[PDB]
Amino acid sequence: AKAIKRIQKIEVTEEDQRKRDLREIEDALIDHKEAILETLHMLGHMNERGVLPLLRGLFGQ
């Protein structure tokens, strides 16, 4: 066909890009699932032990 240069780009809406970015963060959590799960267990123990409430009170007051 004849020579053309103009390209009409595909519309990536604000909401579409937001989903792509959030999905990228979701995939990173999925990849580091074990590390997150372990962090949550560790965090749960810090709360059971005196640690998290003590820090909440140290900054609270």
């Binding site: 066909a1 053309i4 103009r6 390209i7 009409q8 780009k9």
Partner: peptide
Amino acid sequence: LIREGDHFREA
């Protein structure tokens, strides 16, 4: 790119 007349359409 798929040609759409006088321009290229991203497809």
